[PDB]
Design a protein around this ligand. Structure first.
Ligand SMILES: *Cc1cc2c(nc3c(=O)[nH]c(=O)nc-3n2C[C@H](O)[C@H](O)[C@H](O)COP(=O)(O)OP(=O)(O)OC[C@H]2O[C@@H](n3cnc4c(N)ncnc43)[C@H](O)[C@@H]2O)c(*)c1C
Ligand SMILES: *Cc1cc2c(nc3c(=O)[nH]c(=O)nc-3n2C[C@H](O)[C@H](O)[C@H](O)COP(=O)(O)OP(=O)(O)OC[C@H]2O[C@@H](n3cnc4c(N)ncnc43)[C@H](O)[C@@H]2O)c(*)c1C
Ligand SMILES: C=Cc1cc(OC)c2c(c1)[C@H](O)Oc1c-2cc(OC)c2c(O)ccc([C@H]3O[C@@H]([C@@H](C)O)[C@H](O)[C@H]3O)c12
Ligand SMILES: C=Cc1cc(OC)c2c(c1)[C@H](O)Oc1c-2cc(OC)c2c(O)ccc([C@H]3O[C@@H]([C@@H](C)O)[C@H](O)[C@H]3O)c12
Lengths: 491, 492
């Protein structure tokens, strides 16, 4: 239970989150070991008028943790305990636990799985608060759809800090706090010290009331050389990917056992890469997977080089996942998001193609398209703070790089692509049409700027749609002093 | 603590270690949560005559855990606690902890670092028992050079299991058990439940008696396209790499702050890849690093594409490291090892080149050359069970692939290259010449076969040299019933 000031040599490491474009430089970091430590620390800070913020996994796409300047940053990585829920079924998970830790614990102790993300180093803190989706989401829904309770340290009008727990079944103000944590996003209401999970009745199994991890996964990665792909066949492949998702994204369908990630890389990478996994319990021969993959490229001259097989759950999952190692470490990055309810037009796809061929250093520049929908779309838009309940594909527009001197170049490329792709609707994926806005866990500060966003739609509507009002009430009720704020925090 | 039998769905996952060539299929797995669970479980098992083995990180290069058939496998991954020793110098680390957990804990709690390996998923269990080296080893030595104590469950002549702790300062039988754990290799003496680490005086710092982690690391990766490299320039680059290590591998030298990993990939990968890191506290501008890299390719037409920079310790280390993700998962693999005391001949290097160009599916086939020596070579060969104390480069000869039907093909290529490269000395890197044998943590069953090994030097001499006799005595004393054995275990 210690403190790391500017004078301490651990400070330099602590001053970097995953995205190296932003720096976190408080007077001190505090590393708590228990929720009580969190409470005492916050109390000391707010009484003394010091500004605070917390960090779990450090994966934030923006400067939320370290901007504006903080006096105190709580680093939560020691709060990583996983155990049965005190009361009832379910599992309690510390907010400082990473996806990797959670997956391993759930699987090894209970043969259980939650729809956690594909990146093993992401922290539960931000992931859960923002919604959270993953390769299992078409079967299991969003992470917040399994949320039973939240234990969070909040600050009231009299500057008193309290540890409150808010449950799925609570009403009144507690009910609002709980609901606000099912997609409201981190850094808004207080410091979550733990989450409790309990699945919906139709997904729950024993022993702990979570879903069963599949016995086996069909996993497959297919590399397509850019050299074999012209504009026309590119447009065809993309269109088919999207149309397959248009047809096969109902809750409960057989195809909901399948999840694809399409890395549409800038041409300097030499390849497009398709990753697909399917639950082998549902489909022992992986017929659906084979048909999907084959159908993508049938009519074209495009031939992919496949690799993979059938693997046990933990091994297959790690084979498909991104860990905290190699070239994703220490990098500067920028990302944008879009929810798709239907396929992009062919003209949009042509714009994409063109930008993927521009003269640009894009060995780590790409657009990722993920399968979405399925079980996710079972719920109604108002049931959780996350509003998007009828999209079928989710996209992430991404660029990473090393030197600060190249920031403008890379932002330039990303903006150029995104804004042109969505030029028909003011350069953003407006809600209620072919698209349904953006995902708060891929926050994008450009949405605040009229030069970037000409749609008339404010950031809070793209992220929260009609849930914003309720989030605002919850904010007034639970953080009246605006103790927790950042450049895109609830108003 | 709990048990996983054949009807339990978790069994499927537990039946695979990292190397998918081998399967581990006992009647049950047991998952202890404490050292006493380990003791009680072993006791039951040996009393009822059941065969046992343990597993920590599952990184074993061979079938040691699951062959011969076991009735019971103890999976140790829950024994991962890290805390101050009690006491009150040094740190206690559960045998089930991974490199990643240890690095993070040491760094975040004490600004400390041990010379752990470059692979984050490797378990302390096997790593430590075998010796253990890493990017920090030229400054800090081997992991076993920081070993202060070992807490291990052993089985005596009357089939009684007991938890004993053996200390660096112990004499008699206990002293032997401790010494045997400093390089004797896993699966030999009993189930280690924990290690305690306390560094040599000259490396130790407050508050826990471990070394200080560097403030910053220069880290650099350089890619050389095969297309720009002909046989001659390949031989030149390799020769320079080795010669640089011949000159700059004394303990305490400035250059000992530098560590390089050269992935010499089969041509189908399109590139050779050089990774280099240097302690930035010792050399703030990274001059040594820059000169080393430049000197490798000066005279040639070869031009590398570099990337990297100066990073904080945890970030830099993870940037250079291999984690449990992507294409290293679920694969079948084979590896061989060699210690080099001096540069290979140019004719050996030509052999290497030619095999790297053979028509073979080698997108994950390569030879990795790692800087060695420095602090490692401070100790004498008999001080720990690890005998190699004057080598300057360490090589790993590696192939990984997916389909069982291709085993023979890949083994074929690996054997073909290794045995030809060392043809001068019976197809193995014999001790006491240009080479100094093999590293038990890269175990290689081919050393047991006369068709593969024509040197006359038995596996136990290549791995342990003149420490074998002492290891055997320790084995007789501490595992008289040969409860713990495998295809390359210390003979009783
Ligand atoms: C970098 C990265 C992000 C990913 C990746 N994969 C994802 C996936 O497969 N599915 C997803 O749905 N999301 C994926 N993401 C995005 C992550 O979800 C977001 O980046 C998360 O917001 C990150 O969470 P965390 O790692 O904890 O990030 P932080 O930087 O620490 O925090 C963000 C934000 O939230 C506040 N906050 C953190 N913790 C708390 C708690 N305890 N209570 C309140 N508020 C908290 C922080 O202060 C900050 O404001 C794959 C990759 C590589
Ligand atoms: C796969 C892999 C291995 C690496 C990597 N990097 C290394 C590095 O950078 N430096 C090294 O020095 N070594 C590296 N290695 C090799 C590993 O060190 C060895 O492969 C280890 O022996 C593996 O350790 P572990 O993960 O624990 O392997 P297991 O298979 O579980 O066990 C091996 C062996 O030892 C016995 N054993 C395990 N645990 C115990 C305990 N507690 N007590 C006694 N015996 C134990 C097992 O029975 C088995 O016999 C990078 C990569 C990717
Ligand atoms: C559920 C399927 C899924 C599969 C993935 O992989 C198969 C990834 C993701 C989802 C995911 O949503 O995000 C990432 C994935 C993979 C990465 O690497 C290979 C990612 C990376 O290298 C960087 C960032 C992200 C993410 O962080 C956000 C940052 C900016 O906050 C970005 O908006 C994201 O791009 C990655
Ligand atoms: C200290 C520097 C260092 C850096 C490394 O990396 C930068 C690795 C190693 C050392 C190390 O000695 O071993 C490995 C390294 C990297 C890998 O990946 C990138 C390895 C891999 O992918 C597989 C196996 C090994 C190892 O396991 C053994 C298996 C067979 O038991 C093999 O004999 C080894 O090859 C790796």
């Amino acid at each position: 239970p210690f403190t790391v000031g500017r004078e301490d040599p651990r400070y330099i490491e602590l001053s970097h989150s995953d995205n190296h474009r932003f720096v976190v430089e408080p007077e001190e970091f505090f590393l708590p070991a228990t929720p009580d430590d969190v409470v005492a620390s916050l109390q000391k800070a707010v009484t003394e008028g010091r500004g605070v913020a917390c960090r779990s996994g450090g994966h934030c796409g923006q400067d939320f943790v370290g901007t504006p300047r903080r006096d105190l940053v709580l680093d939560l990585h020691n709060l990583h305990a996983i155990g049965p829920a005190a009361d009832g079924a379910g599992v309690r998970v510390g907010s400082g636990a990473t996806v990797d830790q959670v997956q391993k614990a759930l699987f090894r102790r209970w043969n259980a799985a939650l729809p956690l993300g594909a990146c093993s180093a992401v922290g539960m803190g931000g992931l859960v608060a923002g919604g959270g989706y993953g390769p299992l989401s078409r079967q299991l829904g969003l992470v917040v759809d399994h949320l039973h309770a939240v234990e969070v340290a909040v600050v009231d009008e009299s500057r008193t800090v309290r540890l409150v727990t808010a449950r799925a079944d609570d009403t009144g103000d507690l009910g609002e706090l709980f609901w606000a944590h099912t997609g409201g996003g981190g850094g808004n209401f207080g410091v979550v010290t733990a989450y409790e999970f309990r699945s919906p009745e139709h997904l729950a199994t024993e022993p702990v009331g979570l879903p069963r991890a599949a016995g086996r996964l069909h996993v497959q990665k297919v590399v397509f050389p850019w050299a074999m792909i012209d504009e026309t066949s590119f447009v065809t492949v993309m269109r088919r990917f999207f149309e397959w998702h248009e047809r096969h994204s109902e809750p409960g369908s057989p195809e909901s056992s399948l999840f694809a990630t399409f890395f549409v890389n800038h041409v300097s990478s030499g390849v497009l890469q398709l990753m697909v996994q399917q639950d082998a319990d549902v489909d022992p021969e992986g017929e659906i997977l084979a048909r999907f993959v084959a159908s993508l490229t049938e009519g074209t001259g495009v031939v992919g080089i496949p690799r993979g097989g059938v693997m046990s759950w933990l091994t297959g999952t790690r084979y498909m996942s991104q860990a905290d190692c190699g070239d994703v470490m220490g990098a500067r990055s920028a990302s944008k998001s879009a929810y798709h309810r239907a396929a992009p037009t062919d003209e949009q796809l042509s714009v994409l193609h063109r930008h993927l061929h521009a003269d640009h250093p894009g060995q780590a520049s790409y657009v990722m398209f993920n399968s979405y929908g399925g079980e996710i779309n079972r719920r109604g838009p108002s049931d959780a703070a996350v509003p998007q309940r009828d999209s079928v594909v989710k996209s992430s527009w991404f660029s990473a790089w090393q030197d600060a001197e190249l920031d403008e170049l890379h932002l330039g490329w990303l903006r150029g692509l995104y804004e042109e792709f969505f030029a028909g609707t003011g350069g953003v994926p407006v809600t209620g049409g072919r698209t349904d806005g953006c995902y708060i866990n891929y926050p994008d500060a450009d949405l605040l700027d009229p030069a970037r966003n000409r749609s008339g739609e404010p950031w809070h509507h793209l992220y929260y749609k009609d849930n914003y009002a309720r989030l605002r009430s919850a904010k007034r009720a639970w953080d009246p002093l605006n103790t927790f704020h950042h450049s895109m925090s609830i108003g």
